[PDB]
Amino acid sequence: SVVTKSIVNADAEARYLSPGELDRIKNFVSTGERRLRIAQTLTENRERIVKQAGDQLFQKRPDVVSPGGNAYGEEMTATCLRDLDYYLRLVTYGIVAGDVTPIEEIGLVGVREMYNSLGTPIPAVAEGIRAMKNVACSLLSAEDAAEAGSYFDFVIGAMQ
Amino acid sequence: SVVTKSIVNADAEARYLSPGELDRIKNFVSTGERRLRIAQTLTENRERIVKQAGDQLFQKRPDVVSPGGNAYGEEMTATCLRDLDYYLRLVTYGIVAGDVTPIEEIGLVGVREMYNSLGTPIPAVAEGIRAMKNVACSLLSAEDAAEAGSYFDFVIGAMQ
Amino acid sequence: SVVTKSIVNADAEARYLSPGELDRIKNFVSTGERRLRIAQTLTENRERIVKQAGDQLFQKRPDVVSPGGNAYGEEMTATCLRDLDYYLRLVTYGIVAGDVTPIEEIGLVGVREMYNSLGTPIPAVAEGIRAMKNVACSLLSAEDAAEAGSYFDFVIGAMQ
Amino acid sequence: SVVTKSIVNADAEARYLSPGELDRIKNFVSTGERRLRIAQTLTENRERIVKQAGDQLFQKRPDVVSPGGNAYGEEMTATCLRDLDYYLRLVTYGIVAGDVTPIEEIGLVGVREMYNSLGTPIPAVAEGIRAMKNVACSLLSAEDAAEAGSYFDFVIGAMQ
Amino acid sequence: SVVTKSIVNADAEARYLSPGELDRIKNFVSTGERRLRIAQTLTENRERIVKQAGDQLFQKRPDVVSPGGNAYGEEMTATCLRDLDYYLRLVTYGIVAGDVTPIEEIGLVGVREMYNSLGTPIPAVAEGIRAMKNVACSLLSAEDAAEAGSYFDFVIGAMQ
Amino acid sequence: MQDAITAVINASDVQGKYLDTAAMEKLKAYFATGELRVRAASVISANAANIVKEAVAKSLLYSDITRPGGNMYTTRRYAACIRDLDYYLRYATYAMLAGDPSILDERVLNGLKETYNSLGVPIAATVQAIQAMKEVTASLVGADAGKEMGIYFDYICSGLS
Amino acid sequence: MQDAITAVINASDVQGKYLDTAAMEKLKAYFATGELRVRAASVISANAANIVKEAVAKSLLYSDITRPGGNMYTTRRYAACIRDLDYYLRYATYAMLAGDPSILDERVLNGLKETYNSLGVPIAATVQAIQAMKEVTASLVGADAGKEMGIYFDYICSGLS
Amino acid sequence: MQDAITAVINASDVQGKYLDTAAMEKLKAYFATGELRVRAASVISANAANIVKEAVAKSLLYSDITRPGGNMYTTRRYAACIRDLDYYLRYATYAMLAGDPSILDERVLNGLKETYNSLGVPIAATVQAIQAMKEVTASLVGADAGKEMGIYFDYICSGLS
Amino acid sequence: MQDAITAVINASDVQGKYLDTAAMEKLKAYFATGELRVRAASVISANAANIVKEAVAKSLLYSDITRPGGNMYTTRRYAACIRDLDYYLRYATYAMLAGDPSILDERVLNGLKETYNSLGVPIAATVQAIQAMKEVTASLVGADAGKEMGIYFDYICSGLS
Amino acid sequence: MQDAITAVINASDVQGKYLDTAAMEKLKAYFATGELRVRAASVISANAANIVKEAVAKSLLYSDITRPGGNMYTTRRYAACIRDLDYYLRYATYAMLAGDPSILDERVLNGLKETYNSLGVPIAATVQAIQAMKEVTASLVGADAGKEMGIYFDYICSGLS
Amino acid sequence: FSGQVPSQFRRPDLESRLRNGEITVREFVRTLASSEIYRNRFYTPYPNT
Ligand SMILES: CCC1=C(C)/C(=C/C2=NC(=C\c3[nH]c(/C=C4\NC(=O)[C@H](C)[C@H]4CC)c(C)c3CCC(=O)O)/C(CCC(=O)O)=C2C)NC1=O
Ligand SMILES: CCC1=C(C)/C(=C/C2=NC(=C\c3[nH]c(/C=C4\NC(=O)[C@H](C)[C@H]4CC)c(C)c3CCC(=O)O)/C(CCC(=O)O)=C2C)NC1=O
Ligand SMILES: CCC1=C(C)/C(=C/C2=NC(=C\c3[nH]c(/C=C4\NC(=O)[C@H](C)[C@H]4CC)c(C)c3CCC(=O)O)/C(CCC(=O)O)=C2C)NC1=O
Ligand SMILES: CCC1=C(C)/C(=C/C2=NC(=C\c3[nH]c(/C=C4\NC(=O)[C@H](C)[C@H]4CC)c(C)c3CCC(=O)O)/C(CCC(=O)O)=C2C)NC1=O
Ligand SMILES: CCC1=C(C)/C(=C/C2=NC(=C\c3[nH]c(/C=C4\NC(=O)[C@H](C)[C@H]4CC)c(C)c3CCC(=O)O)/C(CCC(=O)O)=C2C)NC1=O
Numbered sequence A, B, C, D, E: 001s002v003v004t005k006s007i008v009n010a011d012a013e014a015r016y017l018s019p020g021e022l023d024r025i026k027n028f029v030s031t032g033e034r035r036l037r038i039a040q041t042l043t044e045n046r047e048r049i050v051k052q053a054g055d056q057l058f059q060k061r062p063d064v065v066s067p068g069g070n071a072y073g074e075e076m077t078a079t080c081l082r083d084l085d086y087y088l089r090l091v092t093y094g095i096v097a098g099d100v101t102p103i104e105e106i107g108l109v110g111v112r113e114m115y116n117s118l119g120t121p122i123p124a125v126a127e128g129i130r131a132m133k134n135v136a137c138s139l140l141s142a143e144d145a146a147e148a149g150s151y152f153d154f155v156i157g158a159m160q
Numbered sequence F, G, H, I, J: 001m002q003d004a005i006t007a008v009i010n011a012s013d014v015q016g017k018y019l020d021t022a023a024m025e026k027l028k029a030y031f032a033t034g035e036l037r038v039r040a041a042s043v044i045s046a047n048a049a050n051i052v053k054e055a056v057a058k059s060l061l062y063s064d065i066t067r068p069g070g071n072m073y074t075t076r077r078y079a080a081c082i083r084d085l086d087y088y089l090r091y092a093t094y095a096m097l098a099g100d101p102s103i104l105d106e107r108v109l110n111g112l113k114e115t116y117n118s119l120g121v122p123i124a125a126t127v128q129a130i131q132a133m134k135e136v137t138a139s140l141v142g143a144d145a146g147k148e149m150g151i152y153f154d155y156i157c158s159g160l161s
Numbered sequence K: 001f002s003g004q005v006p007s008q009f010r011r012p013d014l015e016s017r018l019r020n021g022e023i024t025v026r027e028f029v030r031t032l033a034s035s036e037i038y039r040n041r042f043y044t045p046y047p048n049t
């Protein structure tokens, strides 16, 4: 969490929490309900967003979607979509937390190794994340979309 | 600034500013006007605030200003008031900054060594800052007192 | 050269080059004549082998040739072929040297980072190198080809 | 073994054995028969070579053999001969293995300190080893003498 | 000087000179007149002591003087004796200083490497130093010989 | 380390499912308590020296530990005792801000018993001192902050084992 | 390092006087710029890799520098060139948010020219690439953000040359 | 660490006699078998990544371990699992080339079972996957190379123990 | 390494000659005045804190240096300034005990002027502070010992300027 | 470092074209010279200590440098002279066996003159000793080997000059 | 230089030991310094001085 990151820095410094750091935690408390509301909206529209983003991703990377790609056949495409769904759930968890560190633990560590082991294309995964960002902008308020877009941008960097 | 502290953490992390870190920077941008107003109030009431604080500190520990004390005599008492004024100006800078970064580099690093060399009592200096905190709470709005009190409190803890 | 690598190890040991290492250098001096004949065959098939292997690689990865792929258009396809040709020349130089370290320094060290910037697909490049190895097995005598295939395989492993 | 030393380097690299290193190991497999035959000849003539080298060493260092020397007395001379024969047997083992490192690990590490404790002169021990090397070169074939000379050179460096 | 060595240790520890170290300096200064008187006596009788010790050393190690030794011939023996004379002067300097540091700087730093390069026998050199120490102990007064014995013993240990 | 939000995230990750409404309610409760916890932490930092002084005096002042042979009878041991006590107070304070004691247990309670056994320090006497510090800290902070601080101090007491 | 607010605070500390009206409006200018800065920073992070790729394509790709013997004609050399460009871009984005060139002076531009010279990498080639990156960054960030990003990147390019 | 020839030499050194004729015969047989083993080992190195992928597909793909909470159901966990399999393969390749599994037992198997038990990773399940990988690798390498692969796999079974 | 007695020994070593009467006389003088030097050095160490306090009061305090923007305006700079004077005194007293000015040049005066120039320390202010220390140290040590201490203090000042 | 075959490869890489047949013939000449160089290098390592002793006798022995105050007249100085000569011999042997002088220039040469100037060691005296070492090494290695090793030693001396 | 790019040469077995806790950071540093990775980047090219 944001508190976890700030406390980690303070513990390394071996100092009680600074006034500004405490203020940051207080801001998290103030905006916790709004963050939870955005996360609840994401969970509510999770299935529809997954479907729409999947269509956009297949359009962007037809070879992977087609036979002779990583998502060759309905079963392979379904497994790919399930992995993308796990990404989306992790993104929702990170958005609720307010810190990208939980999402990094879930998916970012060894992401290149996992993609190489599967054989699938990392750039296509990133494009799917971008499609999810557009859908989230449609389904969120402008202030909510900006924060969700920032977490999704960290996800895009993780895909790279 | 709070942005400066976030930048230092990001430089150590070798990563672009975190989305949550940018969010706190946005909060600092929003609170710039309120922080500036609080700092203006402190600067406006500067002479009376530290005058009352000096009386309170000398009342709490009369040996600071008594014969054989560090500040015995008019000139040394004025120098003690200057040291308190240095701290007050640093607190105003820190309130504008929104972070402990301004104060830590000035008056919170090696201050114990300097005061020990000259002979002034570190605990009595800390009490003087506490007296300033009480005066500032009296002279500021309730939530303005809370924020200003937080920055003052970091200064007091540093003296410890 | 293998002698250069042995000299580096000896320098770290702070010892004169080992008698066994010197014997290894003599053995590669013996191997160099047959290696030179194999290298002459490689230079003879510099262009024809590249064309045949390139056709196989293009068949393996049609999407890259397709518009929107890395090698989209005649100019991009020519650049892809030129990169493959540069790798082939590096393979010939490394085979003559006997040490894969010369090949590694010229390329395949940070090549993944270069590919990430350029947009090139590492899997298709690796498959093309493997196809070049198969074409080379047909092109060259088996005894010479077995060592040459290992050099090509070292490049392929670095790519993967 | 030489293959074992290459394997240790490969393990430090954490990569599969180098193509040239594997080729060198294959050459060692071919060379094993010649190493075995030469070693058998050396073992057959080991006792005679030891006696001849001992006579040459006594001629080189009469003072050591005489009273006031390390080998003064029959018992001291016999211990000297036993040390020389043990080193000769170790040399045969190292030549058979094909790895100078195994011989160095077994003995000649801190051998100067061991000779200091015994009181014997390191230069005189070296001269005895040189006489043994000349006898071994005569006993072995010209190809075998070349390898035996290299092992003897390593022993000479250890002696010095 | 002994005070100099203590000062070196104190500077490394980043502390002013210890009361015990100051007491060491006071004692050394108080005994300095006797120390220099003993040193002057050693310098006065240096030549005669050198001749007697050289004869004793040659008697103990005739082989070194004889052909086949480091001091083979009059010229080689003369160079040997000159090195001994330089060591004797260094020993006098160390006794005067009250610390072995001056002698250690002049010699015994890399002295083993120098002896190995020249081929001269370290044990024989040590025995010669011991013979000089015995003669010098007889030559000097009992109090002076006691200090001279300690300095010479340090030299003998360095030789061994 | 771990925090309250991180613990909820860990439970959801183990489930492999999106956050439940009840789990979200737990997170909302943490958000509600955060303001009081943060103000209490700021108060703790301001009066940290006073808390340490009062607790040390109640625990071991004018005692055999201070008296010769009492293991706190050297100036170095006295300073080290204060250092260990201050570290306990500070780490527990950070854990109180987090709302989760896992960070305190992992960071401070790992191997502490073995280290104290090698040191020869009385863990039970330290536990009594920590309980006294909990009482003083509760008094200074207030009832609401004292309850959470007491729970964290109880976790420290369990780690004393 | 320094910030706009921190630098004004430093200047006020040098003067030895509490916040002036001039200090207030300099700080207020930074406060107003903050919204533009943070939005641009998010965009820069999102399109950072694409920015590097576009810049080298516009300036140094498909040239003699990329062709053999051009200081970028190796896989390792090419990766190093992209790395140094990313280093400059990241520190420049930091500095743009900070509002002051102290960060770039302290870290980005310390001994860089001398190291580049001794290596033999062309300072002029780096300067051209930096200007191309500035153009791409201004396009992505927006007009107002591009003006500020131009100032920071200009400091890096000028210091390099 | 000990080579096969080095082990024979060590036995002779302990005996205090020159290497026996029977030991020399064993060394010669080792060289003759080593030529074929080396060729197969080069093949194994070329297809090492493919072998790892095939084993993972055989067991790990579409498995409860992949499902959340299965001790490989994380990005870090998945990277570590694949890496551990590859490291076992590389060490086994070195052991097969040497002809002695002593090096693999000395480092790779040194407390690896205890560490895995502490981690909670299923040693027996990993051993079953490793046995499947060994079977596929033996088939590709050949019967004679499969015999060496069987010795390495037997060391892997001991590591499971 | 250089000391007074050691330097006499070193010069004699360069000659290779046995100890001359002149060398004996110089060494005897060092032996003779060691008593006064030692007693004064102990006094200096005992009153070291008071000496630097007196020196800054007499020279470096209540001026623009400690007023804003004077390179001592901040507590960090002040702490470094008194620390620098303390080091100056410590190595100076080391050298005064040794009797040879070479030691201070080896450590205190090696690159000190360049370092101070780079950081912006006022060379003249440091020199006057050293002179103020010289007066205070002379007062505490006494005339006979202070005169000896003053020579080596003045050597430090000469190196600075 | 760089080797002869590597240098031909480097020239071909700078050109961009594959190795020419004539360039391969140059490489074949290097291969032919390598056999004699290798045998001579083994001989040089065996008699390296004797060669160093012979050169030291030729120049350093019975010399004013060895005499007190001659800059070679210390135990540390004599050991350092021996070590420096040994290091030069080791680098020269590596260069001669490799057949390319790039290694010697890369490691030994860079700032060797500057380091000798700072130390105060006599560069001309070292150069004369290097010539003596070249003569002894040529005698031990043989005429054909002496030309190559002597050329490398002459290159080192030329750089020193 | 960047601090964001640990290139290929990194020692993952050393990382694994450190993660497990078997290798202390001090030992990690010694292995990293001893390895050929450090040698190639620093020892062999630059002079011993
Ligand atoms: C063997 C080394 C050693 C020392 C020295 C030491 C000191 C020491 N001083 C103490 C208290 C104290 N120390 C002082 C000291 C002073 N007050 C003054 O006005 C004077 C200036 C000054 C002494 C001349 C006072 C007043 C207390 C009691 C504090 C209190 O009870 O509130 C205590 C706690 C009470 C106790 O003794 O149980 C200790 C342990 N402990 C040690 O292990
Ligand atoms: C000496 C070592 C070395 C190498 C190898 C190297 C390669 C290299 N390949 C490039 C381009 C490229 N490389 C590819 C590669 C491929 N596209 C595909 O579909 C295939 C799978 C694959 C090859 C078979 C492509 C498509 C480009 C052009 C990229 C673009 O501009 O759109 C470029 C950038 C353009 C330029 O040359 O300026 C370089 C530098 N540079 C070096 O210094
Ligand atoms: C203060 C921050 C900082 C800077 C500035 C820095 C630069 C820096 N650049 C270097 C090399 C280099 N830099 C480049 C970069 C380029 N190639 C090109 O074609 C372009 C003109 C250019 C930039 C786009 C290249 C090719 C090398 C040498 C790589 C090699 O051959 O080993 C090196 C030598 C070590 C190495 O090879 O990486 C350093 C230290 N390091 C730092 O810590
Ligand atoms: C909690 C973090 C986490 C993630 C994300 C994860 C992903 C993951 N992706 C997998 C495979 C896969 N991943 C993909 C991915 C794709 N193929 C495409 O064409 C697209 C471009 C792309 C997604 C849109 C595919 C195709 C497979 C199956 C591999 C195959 O059988 O060919 C597998 C192996 C099969 C299985 O699930 O058992 C896992 C475990 N594992 C984790 O622990
Ligand atoms: C930016 C950080 C900073 C600060 C704060 C600072 C203050 C400061 N306070 C000083 C003195 C002093 N400070 C005190 C302090 C006190 N006496 C008391 O009784 C009280 C308990 C207490 C203050 C409330 C006294 C008495 C002196 C004069 C000392 C003397 O001359 O006897 C001095 C030395 C005299 C001078 O000004 O030259 C400085 C530099 N300097 C700095 O660089």
Ligand SMILES: CCC1=C(C)/C(=C/C2=NC(=C\c3[nH]c(/C=C4\NC(=O)[C@H](C)[C@H]4CC)c(C)c3CCC(=O)O)/C(CCC(=O)O)=C2C)NC1=O
Pocket: E064, E065, E069, E070, E071, E072, E076, E077, E079, E080, E081, E083, E084, E086, E087, E106, E107, E114, E118, E120, E121, E124, E125, E128, J060, J061, J062, J063, J066, J072, J073, J074, J075, J078
């Ligand atoms: C200041 C410290 C210092 C010392 C001691 C020193 C010694 C020293 N001894 C030498 C030679 C020698 N040293 C010896 C020594 C001995 N041979 C024996 O039989 C005895 C056991 C023994 C003496 C008691 C001999 C025989 C030589 C001449 C070797 C030769 O040139 O053949 C040489 C080489 C010739 C020369 O002087 O140029 C040096 C430098 N150098 C120094 O800088």
Ligand SMILES: CCC1=C(C)/C(=C/C2=NC(=C\c3[nH]c(/C=C4\NC(=O)[C@H](C)[C@H]4CC)c(C)c3CCC(=O)O)/C(CCC(=O)O)=C2C)NC1=O
Pocket: J065, J071, J072, J076, J077, J078, J080, J081, J082, J084, J085, J087, J088, J107, J108, J115, J119, J121, J122, J125, J126, J129, K047, K048, K049
């Ligand atoms: C890469 C291989 C390599 C070389 C070549 C090298 C040279 C080298 N020679 C040195 C010293 C030295 N070199 C000499 C050499 C000589 N004095 C003489 O009278 C002769 C003319 C001459 C020998 C032929 C001396 C006397 C010193 C020590 C300087 C001193 O402290 O007085 C030093 C200073 C550190 C030390 O004491 O070792 C270095 C680094 N270092 C290396 O790592």
Ligand SMILES: CCC1=C(C)/C(=C/C2=NC(=C\c3[nH]c(/C=C4\NC(=O)[C@H](C)[C@H]4CC)c(C)c3CCC(=O)O)/C(CCC(=O)O)=C2C)NC1=O
Pocket: H065, H070, H071, H072, H076, H077, H078, H080, H081, H082, H084, H085, H087, H088, H107, H108, H112, H115, H119, H121, H122, H125, H126, H129, K013, K014, K015, K016, K017, K019, K020
């Ligand atoms: C000498 C070569 C070598 C070996 C063999 C080795 C084993 C090894 N594997 C580890 C981790 C691991 N190993 C696995 C493995 C698996 N998970 C599964 O579901 C499968 C059944 C299985 C693979 C077949 C996992 C998941 C971890 C990570 C555990 C964690 O920290 O979370 C760790 C813990 C430290 C770490 O790497 O993070 C070690 C030490 N280390 C070495 O240096």
